[PDB]
Write a protein that binds this ligand. Structure first.
Ligand SMILES: CC(C)(COP(=O)(O)OP(=O)(O)OC[C@H]1O[C@@H](n2cnc3c(N)ncnc32)[C@H](O)[C@@H]1OP(=O)(O)O)[C@@H](O)C(=O)NCCC(=O)NCCS
Ligand SMILES: CC(C)(COP(=O)(O)OP(=O)(O)OC[C@H]1O[C@@H](n2cnc3c(N)ncnc32)[C@H](O)[C@@H]1OP(=O)(O)O)[C@@H](O)C(=O)NCCC(=O)NCCS
Ligand SMILES: CC(C)(COP(=O)(O)OP(=O)(O)OC[C@H]1O[C@@H](n2cnc3c(N)ncnc32)[C@H](O)[C@@H]1OP(=O)(O)O)[C@@H](O)C(=O)NCCC(=O)NCCS
Ligand SMILES: CC(C)(COP(=O)(O)OP(=O)(O)OC[C@H]1O[C@@H](n2cnc3c(N)ncnc32)[C@H](O)[C@@H]1OP(=O)(O)O)[C@@H](O)C(=O)NCCC(=O)NCCS
Ligand SMILES: CC(C)(COP(=O)(O)OP(=O)(O)OC[C@H]1O[C@@H](n2cnc3c(N)ncnc32)[C@H](O)[C@@H]1OP(=O)(O)O)[C@@H](O)C(=O)NCCC(=O)NCCS
Ligand SMILES: CC(C)(COP(=O)(O)OP(=O)(O)OC[C@H]1O[C@@H](n2cnc3c(N)ncnc32)[C@H](O)[C@@H]1OP(=O)(O)O)[C@@H](O)C(=O)NCCC(=O)NCCS
Lengths: 252, 268, 255, 247, 240, 263
């Protein structure tokens, strides 16, 4: 029941596996898995893998690569071509599952090639985990009954203080279901959001409605936002939008 | 030349025509034509026609009807079905012309049936030329200042100060107008006007409403965001948005970014 | 004295003059003078004159020209070169008087050339030496019109339209002793014209050399925020180095 | 039906009366009635009356007195004693009835003494007083007809925003006093001078609860601290803004 | 006063006390005392006590309970019945004294019963952080140095301050104020007071946030009316 | 390349020096240098110096003094008389160099007297800037600072008050105090990043643009406060603090032209 029993379950699971490939995103969870894997198995027995793709930003990729490096892991980036799957390309309500399918298939290929006994990810005890289970990836924190409070507890005891505090969210969510994602309109959404964040709005969505951008901001930020209206209008128009709008309902 | 000669040209054209039908909107221009026609020819020699349609509000029609009655004209309301023309229903870039054609075709029928010698409208300084409609203020070289001068001299003080625009302008070209989405746009704009924003547009982008406000009002508007969101969603929009460029985008920008906004708008 | 008596005095004075030139600004006072002149003497015996100059906006000039025509007057624009007078150019407390002198001197020339018996202005009762020295007549003042009598006769004549936002000389944007130049005048005039175009009809761009100090009514400053960057860049393109908003609001100083 | 017909009804009614006393408030409605009475009957057959009282601002009284002269009327100010009636002083939902009673009783006394055939007020269509003729209402004037006829007569000057009876700033069952009335009156006068012509300072003893039109609240923030200190110096302990806005 | 001297001063003081009960609120300060006490004395010689009561939010109790368990302490919740004291119930200007009395009496009773030598708190009943001359900045230095990243960042105050002196506190009106403030915080205003004036709610916000609040005026008016206020108002003077 | 190589370059340089004096301002950069020196060389081999002057707020001098001791350094404050140099006093465009010149002369005097092999400062991307030598950019400073557990540094970054005065304006104790008091007042209202630029009878306030909407409630109090400090007109710069950094690409280019026109 205690953290010590949970940690022990995690330690013994790693020792049994001996050589692992870690799906590393930079979150606290996969940071904890990667640190435990390094401490239990040694740097030559752990491969940290960070996936680059069109649905996530270069900034989050670069941050994860640097964090794995900082922890002392051998880290390798791999590029996924999500738009090659028609379910993802056409953004069906099922697209998340096919992206997860391609993700775990790639990490399995890497693990098969480096002699790893398993792919590990950072899933915990809190569905969407269908793709992981189908590929055989192990969520050791979940197996060891780690809740979020235990992750923080163990991180503190191990002296981990550095991880990515901004949880990534697939850009697919900026597009209505049935809308076709392209290299161009994905980049236009990410470039628009990057500009808005640089203005001091870290929580933002630029929702894509063909010629319309619909900006979602937390409502308590909209009053301050007004000073930027025209600069935002023209910037996002130079990115290719015809109309730049603010959702009166706010973020979500 | 002088105002006096311009009036005399207008009087002489009316005297020659003897019996006229006047396209009356309630604006100052058609108010001047109707007042002049009544003064020169008499009530029994004038028919004022006010057209109702789906592209304009019943409030504007009712005001124009009441204004024509106030002048003492025999008034005839007529209803146009603009949506029966596929150019108008599908909102093509030439949709305005087919509306003009259908408008002047109805007025010609009314004038032919009541023995008028011409249809008159209030245009100043075209489906009208093909229809044979006469714009006597334009023929007599009246500019807007001459209209105002003659109106004041005739003692005309009551007219439509707000020239309202066809609801067609709220729909992108190629979007099909329907009875429901017209009513949706009209009710949304009416609600926003009732909140204290008399200059407003609710542009229709299917499930998105894109609200245009004069930019100096956007700060005041924030207090109403949630009520406007839920109101326009109850009218049938899924998403309710405020255009960051405001109403008449670019007209208030600095020189450089006004040119930039026009370079963008002309790329589209 | 009743309003009818004040009107009859004014009517008799116009009748005696037969033909007049009216200095017309578009304000309610000169609108009343012009309308009465038109009613008593007829449009052919009245010339309305609107003076254009560097110290007042083209918008107020254009409005006054349109208003005089809407009243039914023959109207003539005339341009004064105020900056040719060193008193006006050096922006001293007597500059206004020398401007009035050049104003009425021009109006006298117009009146002599069209056969008018007098120049009329819109002054009423409550710096008029230049008017008196020039022999210009203020018939509203002569007939004991106060501002309430002006409103009453305007109502009786059906006058409802005039310029309610009376313009003041751009010289007030410069501290005393600052030399007015064509360049710095145009800089201030263009800055204020832009700000009015944003929806702020009451505004001052105070000139502090490389600093512009914008005065707005305090109840409007919240509305202004959406325009900060465009106003900043617009006014720098007009030549200012720094574009600022006075926290004290419209006419914050005066002291 | 037409404006001209309603005007003609008004003209005929005035002609029949020959001599009237006009309850004049300075609003557009009583401005139109007063001007029509003067135009049909002449200055010597019209008496304009402006009622001053503790429940309406001295500023509106002064404006109306000046406007009545501007319209061409002989004008008489009269001061009403609303707080001398216990029904009004104790501020019940029936207070309105007793104030109207005293108002029309005074105007009727004035009219009896100058030989008027009636007291006229500015009530319009869209509620009847028996002791006064509301000729605009009898002639079926709507607010739109008042404005159209006003423009046609060249009337442009009237009180555009009536402050209305200060009794509405106090809860029912609260006793009105000269002190608390004065406190509310001075508070609203200050807020109006800042550029908010439509405002209420609702009285909750040590709390002031300010009602502004909601579209004005964003502009108001620049004044928060000055209003707070001013209304505290007038005697409120806490100065607040109602989040619901005006009404 | 190097960090090493201040830490060593505290280390020696804890070591001398052998067995401790920690008044733990979830703030960074009591978080520091608890972590240090556990490290110096061991888990089985430290009991963290978090007080539940009507004058503080259930959210703050749950977070502090969770945070202390997260650090590895044996944690014990205790319930104080503040409203049973007539001074607290009637909200006298002296009520604060009687509240502290029951709090330290309860913690003293807990400590005597489990063999603790003292009750410790996190003030910067002994405050060893205060004795070691800890400022807020050096507390921060040790927190990172010990790997501490989680604590209660918004230290609450007693709900009594929302009522004028002499007002009777009730279960209903406390719940009403507490619910109103929870709603306003959920909108993005972590520093707020809903001051209780019978049928009037008077909201205090930091003055620099009042402009941001306007978008919420109508929802807040109607929300707090459904909680029982007749009028919902914003204090023009701001928070305090 | 990697953060570890950069740290190792820094470690090797400190070991080589053996005894150092650290110019410590309280910024994250000089905090990183000081912590590294202490960890590599030991407390008895490092002296932290915080320079006070008429151009530095006493509050920032105190904060740096407290942070250096907090890190475990022997720390010594010293005051420079910048206003005794006519180039600094009359605020010429070269004032920056003469202030830095007098700064480094004082630190060199201290290092010669304490047996230090060099003076170290926190310069990044005979004074040594070891962070710059080891190729540290701002991202690497933040990353290493996090790794050592550094949590305290001056987040509201000190600049010389001279930057509030136009070139050619004479700095005095009175007008410096006027600027410092105006800025301290604004910080007390909740605006930690602020400049009160001095234009004789005009104060021109620079705020981050995302805060200007919040400022409206304080307009009258700030106007009256700064007038009592001696300004005639109290104004807000419409371009804000660090004008241009947040603009769209076109207008950022435009404002970069405007700024360059006054250089
Ligand atoms: C796992 C996945 C399917 C998304 O599900 P999710 O639970 O929302 O994803 P998370 O971002 O919480 O990632 C969980 C773990 O996956 C791994 N992971 C996620 N993104 C990764 C990346 N780019 N590189 C390597 N590992 C990655 C990590 O081990 C991570 O743990 P952590 O971020 O808590 O430290 C994602 O990997 C994917 O490929 N596509 C996204 C599909 C989606 O949006 N699903 C919605 C859930 S119904
Ligand atoms: C007149 C019309 C043909 C449009 O042309 P337009 O000249 O730009 O439109 P206007 O509104 O200025 O019409 C001018 C005159 O038409 C007449 N008119 C307009 N609407 C009228 C109505 N509902 N009933 C009767 N007459 C009407 C009036 O004489 C009016 O004079 P006014 O200045 O006093 O209002 C219009 O009546 C029509 O049939 N369809 C409008 C569709 C559209 O969008 N047209 C754009 C033109 S670019
Ligand atoms: C009258 C004058 C001599 C100064 O005296 P003043 O009473 O302080 O100035 P005012 O602005 O009140 O002008 C009073 C009258 O002068 C006349 N006047 C003022 N500006 C005028 C102009 N531009 N053209 C014609 N007449 C003008 C009008 O009769 C005006 O009456 P009104 O404005 O009350 O209707 C004035 O003519 C002058 O000096 N300059 C005129 C303004 C100008 O140069 N340009 C345009 C101003 S918008
Ligand atoms: C007029 C009164 C008798 C009540 O009637 P009301 O309809 O509530 O008030 P109104 O403001 O609509 O008054 C209507 C007309 O009364 C006359 N009137 C009102 N106040 C007047 C005053 N101070 N002096 C003279 N006439 C006055 C005017 O003719 C006015 O027309 P106008 O203001 O539209 O131009 C009011 O003056 C009074 O004495 N007491 C009102 C107190 C109250 O609580 N009323 C609640 C009723 S809803
Ligand atoms: C501690 C107490 C007795 C008063 O102290 P205070 O200075 O007002 O409040 P603090 O929150 O600073 O309490 C100091 C320490 O008490 C302890 N403490 C406070 N509330 C606690 C709780 N609910 N459970 C356990 N320990 C608690 C903690 O060690 C805390 O340290 P930290 O908050 O700095 O991390 C208070 O907790 C109490 O029981 N009643 C409040 C009395 C009051 O209203 N006082 C008004 C002051 S004039
Ligand atoms: C050192 C000085 C010259 C600032 O120049 P700088 O090197 O560009 O300034 P930085 O902000 O990069 O600081 C560099 C380092 O100098 C040292 N330093 C600066 N001010 C210091 C002070 N008052 N006391 C001690 N050390 C100080 C610190 O090591 C500092 O590291 P930091 O990044 O944590 O602040 C400054 O002391 C001075 O004399 N004037 C400041 C303004 C100026 O005109 N500078 C000209 C130099 S470009």
């Amino acid at each position: 029941a205690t953290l010590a029993t949970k940690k022990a379950t995690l330690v013994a699971a790693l020792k049994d596996l001996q050589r692992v490939t870690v799906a590393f995103s930079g979150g606290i969870d996969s940071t904890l898995v990667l640190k435990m894997a390094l401490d239990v198995l040694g740097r030559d027995n752990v491969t940290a893998v960070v996936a680059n793709s069109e649905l996530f930003t270069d900034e989050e990729f670069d941050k994860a690569m640097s964090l794995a490096e900082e922890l002392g892991a051998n880290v390798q980036g791999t590029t996924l071509d999500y738009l090659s799957d028609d379910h993802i390309k056409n953004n069906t309500p099922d697209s998340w599952y096919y992206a997860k399918k391609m993700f775990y298939s790639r990490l399995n290929d890497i693990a098969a090639n480096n002699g790893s006994a398993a792919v590990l990810d950072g899933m915990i005890k809190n569905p969407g985990l269908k793709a992981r289970s189908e590929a055989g990836a192990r969520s050791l924190l979940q197996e060891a009954d780690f809740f979020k409070t235990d992750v923080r507890a163990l991180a503190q005891e191990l002296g981990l203080t550095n991880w990515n505090k901004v949880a990534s969210c697939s850009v697919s969510s900026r597009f209505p279901y049935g809308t076709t994602l392209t290299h161009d309109n994905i980049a236009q959404v990410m470039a628009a959001e990057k500009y808005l964040r640089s203005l001091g709005f870290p929580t933002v969505r630029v929702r894509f409605h063909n010629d319309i951008a619909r900006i979602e901001l937390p409502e308590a930020r909209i009053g301050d936002f007004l000073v930027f209206n025209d600069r935002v209008n023209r910037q996002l128009q130079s990115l290719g939008f015809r109309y730049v709008t603010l959702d009166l309902g706010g973020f979500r």
